[PDB]
């Protein structure tokens, strides 16, 4: 663990060491022979008080069979300590690399027992990180399937554990293979990562938010990853900007702005369209204008914010509310939409979603069907969608009623009746307009 200085690392080390047991008792219990017990004792006297070296290998072997006391999380306790303690962990990773036969066993040594070792597994099997050549791409790929890392990093209640896991993941990005493994994990961990920034939008919280921002930036450094995420976490693109705007920490804001700019980097596929959509929907352009007006002492953060502002200006130089309308139609789980603002844009929008023949609006038909399926439930998003889809249908039908037939044949009358059937407030509130 290169970053053991972090308070989370100190807590992990303290938790791991709080359950240490003597090797003499293990020898008395017949868990290991005299030589193995002596080696375990030497490893313990090295890690936390020559010591170690040839020892701590038999300690790991004993902990493989022993399932309690120091044998439960001895590897995690040794890793959490700094390399100054006889190079424990730091030299242990290199020694294991020199002996691949037990390497897998060492990788399996960590991530056992309670969270004290589960969280330290990311800092136990890969305590050396991607440096020194101890690990490999295959090891990271295999370890990315462990659920202990997800439980630790994404633990909403365990703020300290989540911050420690996020920091370890961010540090692991040194090697491109480790970065790819981290991106693969993020492809499924998206909920927790996005929620971290969402909570950061308004002292373990700051550290956790910074770790999440670092992980997001590291994953987003690859243009392909950012382009793929734009299709699943497009709202997160502006959520990160909002979190940075609320966040006062200079380094955290710099990281968030850098991640946002990377999302808009020319390398990212469809960079221009993505930037334009972000500016139009997430108010990234007004936010960048405010950041330019605002002042900060972080020179790197200032440069990142200026680059983001330039990207936003370029995106808005060819922006239109039609992109926002398309995004809203893609969402179909909201209460109101941009076109409801006034009668200006809708004047064209009435024939925009329909493609002048309702053909392009069939996607709007599917969105309304999904919103009606959700409408039968009382969820806030459900009621919002029930109202919004019906209001948009009424607005579209008010002009050029030909497409109404397509809606009528597609269950438009039945959908309107069901919206106002019963147990609905906004659904009926919009079905009234639809049927009027």
């Amino acid at each position: 663990k290169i970053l053991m200085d972090s308070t989370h690392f100190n807590e992990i080390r303290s938790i791991i060491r709080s359950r240490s047991v003597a090797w003499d008792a293990l020898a008395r219990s017949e868990e290991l022979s005299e030589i193995d017990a002596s080696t375990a004792k030497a490893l313990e006297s090295i890690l936390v008080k020559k010591v170690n070296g040839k020892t701590l290998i038999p300690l790991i072997h004993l902990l493989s069979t022993s399932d309690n006391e120091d044998c439960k999380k001895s590897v995690q306790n040794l890793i959490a300590e700094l390399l100054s303690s006889d190079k424990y962990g730091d030299d242990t990773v290199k020694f294991f690399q020199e002996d691949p036969k037990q390497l897998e066993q060492l990788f399996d040594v960590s991530l056992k027992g309670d969270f004290q070792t589960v969280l330290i597994s990311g800092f136990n099997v890969v305590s050396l990180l991607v440096q020194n050549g101890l690990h490999n791409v295959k090891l990271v790929e295999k370890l990315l399937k462990n659920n202990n890392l997800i439980n630790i990093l994404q633990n909403i209640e365990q703020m300290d554990t989540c911050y420690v896991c996020i920091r370890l993941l961010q540090e692991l990005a040194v090697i491109p293979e480790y970065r790819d493994v981290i991106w693969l994990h993020e492809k499924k961990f998206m909920p927790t990562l996005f929620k971290i920034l969402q909570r950061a939008t308004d002292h373990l919280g700051i550290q956790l938010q910074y770790h999440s921002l670092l992980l997001i930036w590291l994953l987003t450094f690859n243009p392909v990853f950012a382009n793929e995420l734009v299709q699943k976490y497009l709202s997160d693109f502006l959520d990160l900007l909002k979190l940075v705007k609320i966040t006062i920490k200079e380094k955290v804001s710099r990281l968030c702005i850098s991640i946002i700019l990377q999302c808009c980097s020319t390398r990212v596929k469809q960079h221009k369209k993505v930037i334009k959509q972000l500016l139009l929907l997430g108010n990234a352009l007004p936010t960048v204008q405010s950041l330019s007006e605002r002042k900060y002492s972080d020179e790197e953060l200032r440069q990142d914010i200026s680059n983001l502002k330039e990207i936003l200006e370029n995106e808005y130089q060819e922006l239109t509310s039609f992109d926002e309308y398309v995004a809203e139609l893609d969402s179909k789980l909201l209460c109101w939409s941009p076109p409801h603002v006034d009668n200006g844009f809708w004047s064209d929008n009435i024939d925009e979603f329909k493609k002048d023949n309702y053909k392009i609006f069939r996607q709007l038909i599917e969105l309304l069907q999904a919103k009606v399926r959700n409408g039968d439930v009382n969820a806030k998003q459900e009621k919002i969608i029930i109202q919004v889809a019906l209001n948009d249908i009424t607005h579209v039908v008010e002009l050029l009623p030909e497409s109404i037939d397509v809606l009528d044949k597609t269950g438009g009358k039945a959908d309107i009746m069901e919206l106002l059937n019963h147990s609905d407030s906004r659904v009926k509130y919009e079905a009234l307009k639809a049927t009027q």
């Binding site: 990005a173 040194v174 590291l218 450094f221």
Partner: peptide, 24 residues
């Protein structure tokens, strides 16, 4: 910090690809 780490390959590999190999 990490910006320079990315720029390392962003320049060393990209420069040759876009200005050396294309001259072949």
């Amino acid at each position: 910090q990490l910006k320079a780490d990315q720029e390392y390959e962003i320049e060393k590999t990209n420069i040759v690809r876009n200005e050396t190999n294309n001259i072949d």
